[PDB]
Amino acid sequence: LNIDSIIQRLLEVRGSKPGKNVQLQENEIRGLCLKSREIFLSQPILLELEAPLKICGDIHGQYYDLLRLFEYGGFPPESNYLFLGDYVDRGKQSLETICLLLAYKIKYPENFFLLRGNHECASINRIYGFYDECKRRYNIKLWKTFTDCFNCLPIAAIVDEKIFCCHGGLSPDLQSMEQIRRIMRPTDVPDQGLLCDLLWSDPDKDVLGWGENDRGVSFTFGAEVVAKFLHKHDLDLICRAHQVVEDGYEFFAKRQLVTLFSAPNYCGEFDNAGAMMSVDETLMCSFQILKP
Amino acid sequence: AVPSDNLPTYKLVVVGDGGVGKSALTIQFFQKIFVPDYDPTIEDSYLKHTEIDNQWAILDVLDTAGQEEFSAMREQYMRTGDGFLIVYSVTDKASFEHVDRFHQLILRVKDRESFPMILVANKVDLMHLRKITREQGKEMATKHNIPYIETSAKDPPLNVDKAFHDLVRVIRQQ
Amino acid sequence: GVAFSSNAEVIKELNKCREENSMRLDLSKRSIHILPSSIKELTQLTELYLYSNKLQSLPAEVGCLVNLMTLALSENSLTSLPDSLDNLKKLRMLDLRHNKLREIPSVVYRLDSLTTLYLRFNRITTVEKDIKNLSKLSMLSIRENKIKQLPAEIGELCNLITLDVAHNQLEHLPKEIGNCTQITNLDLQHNELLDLPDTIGNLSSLSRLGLRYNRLSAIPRSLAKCSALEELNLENNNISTLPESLLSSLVKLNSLTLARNCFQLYPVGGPSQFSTIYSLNMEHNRINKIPFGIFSRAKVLSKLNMKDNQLTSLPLDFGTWTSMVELNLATNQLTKIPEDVSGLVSLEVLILSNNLLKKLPHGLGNLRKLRELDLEENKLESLPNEIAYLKDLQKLVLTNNQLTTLPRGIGHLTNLTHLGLGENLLTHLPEEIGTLENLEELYLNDNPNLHSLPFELALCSKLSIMSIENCPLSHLPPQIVAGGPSFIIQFLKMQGPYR
Numbered sequence A: 001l002n003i004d005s006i007i008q009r010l011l012e013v014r015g016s017k018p019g020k021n022v023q024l025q026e027n028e029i030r031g032l033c034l035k036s037r038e039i040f041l042s043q044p045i046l047l048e049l050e051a052p053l054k055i056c057g058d059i060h061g062q063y064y065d066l067l068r069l070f071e072y073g074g075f076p077p078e079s080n081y082l083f084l085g086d087y088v089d090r091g092k093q094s095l096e097t098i099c100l101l102l103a104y105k106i107k108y109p110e111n112f113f114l115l116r117g118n119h120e121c122a123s124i125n126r127i128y129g130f131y132d133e134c135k136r137r138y139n140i141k142l143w144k145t146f147t148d149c150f151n152c153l154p155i156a157a158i159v160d161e162k163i164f165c166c167h168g169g170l171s172p173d174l175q176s177m178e179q180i181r182r183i184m185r186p187t188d189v190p191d192q193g194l195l196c197d198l199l200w201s202d203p204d205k206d207v208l209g210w211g212e213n214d215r216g217v218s219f220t221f222g223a224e225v226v227a228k229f230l231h232k233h234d235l236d237l238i239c240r241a242h243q244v245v246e247d248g249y250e251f252f253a254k255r256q257l258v259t260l261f262s263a264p265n266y267c268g269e270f271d272n273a274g275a276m277m278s279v280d281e282t283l284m285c286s287f288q289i290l291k292p
Numbered sequence B: 001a002v003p004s005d006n007l008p009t010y011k012l013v014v015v016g017d018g019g020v021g022k023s024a025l026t027i028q029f030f031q032k033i034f035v036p037d038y039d040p041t042i043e044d045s046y047l048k049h050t051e052i053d054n055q056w057a058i059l060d061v062l063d064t065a066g067q068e069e070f071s072a073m074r075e076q077y078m079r080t081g082d083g084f085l086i087v088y089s090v091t092d093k094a095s096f097e098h099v100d101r102f103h104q105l106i107l108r109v110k111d112r113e114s115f116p117m118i119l120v121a122n123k124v125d126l127m128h129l130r131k132i133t134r135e136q137g138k139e140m141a142t143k144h145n146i147p148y149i150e151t152s153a154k155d156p157p158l159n160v161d162k163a164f165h166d167l168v169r170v171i172r173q174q
Numbered sequence C: 001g002v003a004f005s006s007n008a009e010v011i012k013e014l015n016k017c018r019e020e021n022s023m024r025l026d027l028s029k030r031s032i033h034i035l036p037s038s039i040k041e042l043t044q045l046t047e048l049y050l051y052s053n054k055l056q057s058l059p060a061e062v063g064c065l066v067n068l069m070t071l072a073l074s075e076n077s078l079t080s081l082p083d084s085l086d087n088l089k090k091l092r093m094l095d096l097r098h099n100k101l102r103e104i105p106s107v108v109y110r111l112d113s114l115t116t117l118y119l120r121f122n123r124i125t126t127v128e129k130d131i132k133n134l135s136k137l138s139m140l141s142i143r144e145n146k147i148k149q150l151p152a153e154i155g156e157l158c159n160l161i162t163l164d165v166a167h168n169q170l171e172h173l174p175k176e177i178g179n180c181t182q183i184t185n186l187d188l189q190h191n192e193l194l195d196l197p198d199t200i201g202n203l204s205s206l207s208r209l210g211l212r213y214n215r216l217s218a219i220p221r222s223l224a225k226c227s228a229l230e231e232l233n234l235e236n237n238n239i240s241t242l243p244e245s246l247l248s249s250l251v252k253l254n255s256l257t258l259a260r261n262c263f264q265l266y267p268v269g270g271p272s273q274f275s276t277i278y279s280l281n282m283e284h285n286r287i288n289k290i291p292f293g294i295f296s297r298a299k300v301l302s303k304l305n306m307k308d309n310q311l312t313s314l315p316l317d318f319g320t321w322t323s324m325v326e327l328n329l330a331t332n333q334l335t336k337i338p339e340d341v342s343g344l345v346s347l348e349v350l351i352l353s354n355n356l357l358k359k360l361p362h363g364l365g366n367l368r369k370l371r372e373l374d375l376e377e378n379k380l381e382s383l384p385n386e387i388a389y390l391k392d393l394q395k396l397v398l399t400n401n402q403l404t405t406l407p408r409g410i411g412h413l414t415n416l417t418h419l420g421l422g423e424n425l426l427t428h429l430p431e432e433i434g435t436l437e438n439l440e441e442l443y444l445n446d447n448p449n450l451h452s453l454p455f456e457l458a459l460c461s462k463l464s465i466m467s468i469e470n471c472p473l474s475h476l477p478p479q480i481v482a483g484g485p486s487f488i489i490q491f492l493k494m495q496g497p498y499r
Ligand SMILES: Nc1nc2c(ncn2[C@@H]2O[C@H](COP(=O)(O)OP(=O)(O)CP(=O)(O)O)[C@@H](O)[C@H]2O)c(=O)[nH]1
Pocket: B016, B017, B018, B019, B020, B021, B022, B023, B024, B025, B035, B036, B037, B038, B039, B040, B041, B042, B064, B065, B066, B067, B122, B123, B124, B125, B126, B151, B152, B153, B154
């Protein structure tokens, strides 16, 4: 597995006509999953991260929105990246998107990091299009390889002991980060529990306490839940993805929680913009917003 | 959904020897998955908000060491508990006689003649390795006058929810 | 701070403990940011527990309590220890797991009486050479730390009983650690070890050896001298062969896992190496052909796992695995199942999904105890009639197969509970399904070739969820089909000819 050649064959298309496909032999894609899962398992589930860092949100199967991020913020190794889940489903070019992200994780384990999102379940990607793309392009077995690798993804991460990064949001069962480190993997997201809420919850302002999502897998939370979570464990930012915002980045509950969505023109029917966040040593966070 | 304030908290201590399934039974009940790896335990504290008999509760389950090497802290963990699951493998004969020692230890630490605990027979799905039968389990269960539950933690779970739920009913009885 | 471009309770407990002169003072789970200086007054305190609190640094009055043996500080935010703690000449137990420690403090190196040390889930990067003073140490555990090398002095730890070094980025092990001869619990899981020292075989009594998820290429021949082993785990290890270490270790061997290795054949040795085995995990690594008679001496064996391999044809000795309970052959290249399968009388679960199975053998009707038959993506033209004799089936799926008709023997499977037949181009089915009243879930999704449902199925009323969202149903009116599975259930209840 030449991580470098792969990266070259995938970045060759950069700057060209959008929607162009990149043909990879299947054993690179299987090899990328097998090699990267060990990197996921060796590192802790609750990841500790060091500045400088450039963070992100969701890029659903959109390989030419991804390459725009790497230009604005900078390609590795001259920068460090964190991706908060949801890179598959809905978008047309998903195999190319996930392959590039999985490539930089192998070659830069201490500077590249990927979390887990909701569409990393074996069941959710069945409905929402990732199941179909695997059929026509490569195979049915290759889809099972991805969901095996998705099981070993870290659930949350902590940056400079101040920034808390999760795709979905908090859980009522979370009273200490010690519990997150006790989660056993490889695991599948259940209908209820501590794990599920982290890949599925979402803040909703109206609920002062807790309330059910519009979807029927988990339940929301409120502005008081995050604050009591931040003051207890001595943090100051909860960075999230999951949903779709118009401006790319939106702030919830007095900034303590910021959501980042980086796939503009979602699935071809949205006017949303994309955003990426960079944080330096003094923990100043700056936003690099992609044009709608 | 979950009640905002004044939620009763129950500290359930899972006590037994090594290999009696204390960790797997706790992982199954909390994360709905079965772990096939044998990792010795020192102290694991889980938490969950669940509704039992139309009543919400917090099931603070505290897995314990079991083995004497790690049991240097074991007697301290028993002291703060509220209910005990004396878990013994039906395929492990030795852990069955140790139920008496565990009951004596629980009575000694908490300084009481009778305490709420339930004898739990784990690994019941291993029928062709079963060595402790149901009547043998029950006669010792009534010998100490404690409830008896059959339980398997491998998918699909058998009474795994019931085992924790039954003790919660037992604890609120007094 | 990021920018955009308990004390009252604890003091009372100390006062109480000071009055009763108790050997124990418990301040655990009280979330104390700072342990009070008053702790010094209680000199005669055998044990102190401060775990799960918010302490960042201990006060220097800990040194005053010489009459102390047990200290618990785990799950805190500690970064350093006071130097006055060296005055404790009687301390033998220290708990410092799940902390923000960056390196092992020099204070710990100056405690001779210490016996058990818990340094786990920290940011320890180096281990100093001044552990010779810790001659009385017996329990040392490091579970989540960033050490890169172990000091050469560790071989002098004669009193050490358990060494737990996992997830600790170790590139090598000291060659002289085998001079302890008193360790039975050594774990090196999820490290980066490249090789094992040859002196590890001098450990006469070793029971637990966690050695998975490390980039080993082989194992030392000397390791076979440890006759107390029970479970040898080798997941994600670049191993291709073993030097007959199993035969010499056939003493208390229980389970063997060789998952996700780079294997290409079974380890070179006699069939006796699996005499006392109980489980096996040979998944994710190519195996090709299993040799004949290699499982003859496995009198006890419960499970086999062979997922993600290159199996082409099962060996002719398949019929002699009478003591085997479970099997798993998913994601392989199996072509034909021989008639010898009739000998597996005790078998209970059999999975054969993702293979090339045109037709099932007629010997399947002999195996009474079977409960599972997963045959997804096998390209099955039709099932054999021998399914009627079996009784104990409870969950079988035939998804992604080319079957168009089912055998008449469906009503005999009275124990059947879960059946999956979707995406199979099914046209018509026998009426015997009505006898099966215990069904709960059934799948016929994405089948364009069925038009009418049997009237006898109307008698099955215990079905709970039916997935027919994507189904043509040309003969039946779209209103009842698109109304919902429940509306069809009532349509079965009285609109059907049966009552
Ligand atoms: N078949 C079956 N196996 C079980 C069951 N419960 C646990 N196990 C087995 O137990 C093993 C894990 O043992 P574990 O629970 O960690 O041991 P323990 O009893 O908690 C004591 P220790 O502190 O030494 O770990 C798993 O490999 C699993 O196969 C069960 O209900 N059925």
